[PDB]
Amino acid sequence: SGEYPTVNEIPVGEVRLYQIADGVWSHIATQSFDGAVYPSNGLIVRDGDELLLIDTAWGAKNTAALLAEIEKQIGLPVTRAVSTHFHDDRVGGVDVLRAAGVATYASPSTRRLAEAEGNEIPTHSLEGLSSSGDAVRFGPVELFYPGAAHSTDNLVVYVPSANVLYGGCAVHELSSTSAGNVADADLAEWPTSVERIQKHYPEAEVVIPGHGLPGGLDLLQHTANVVKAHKN
Ligand SMILES: C[C@@H](c1cccc2c(-c3cncc(O)c3)c(C(=O)O)[nH]c12)N1C[C@]2(C[C@@H](CN)C2)OC1=O
Ligand SMILES: [Zn+2]
Ligand SMILES: [Zn+2]
Locate all alpha helices (DSSP H) within the chain, ordered by sequence. 60-73, 88-91, 94-99, 108-117, 190-200, 218-231
Ligand 1 mutation pick, 56, 87, 94, 181, max ligand atoms within 8 A of CB: 181
Closest to 104 (Cα-Cα) out of 93, 115, 113, 116:
93
Q: Is residue 172 among the annotated active site residues? A: no
Question: Across-strand partners of 104?
Answer: 81
**Ligand 1 in contact with 150 (CB < 6 A)?**
yes
**Ligand 1 in contact with 211 (CB < 6 A)?**
yes
Is beta strand 50-54 parallel, antiparallel or unpaired with respect to 36-47? antiparallel
Resolution in angstrom units: 1.2
Give DSSP secondary structure letters for 105-162.
Answer: EE-HHHHHHHHHHT----SEE--S-SSTT-EEEETTEEEE---SSSSSS--EEEETTT
CB 215 within 8 A of CB 173: yes
Q: What residues does each domain of the chain span?
A: 7-231
d(CA 61, CA 65): 6
Architecture of domain 7-231: 4-Layer Sandwich (3.60)
Which ligand neighbours the alpha carbon of 33 most closely? 1
Which ligand 1 atom is nearest residue 180's CA?
Answer: 18
**Ligand 1 in contact with 38 (CB < 6 A)?**
yes
Amino acid (one-letter) located at 170: A
CB 41 within 8 A of CB 209: yes
Give the method of determination.
Answer: X-ray
CA-based end-to-end distance of the chain:
40
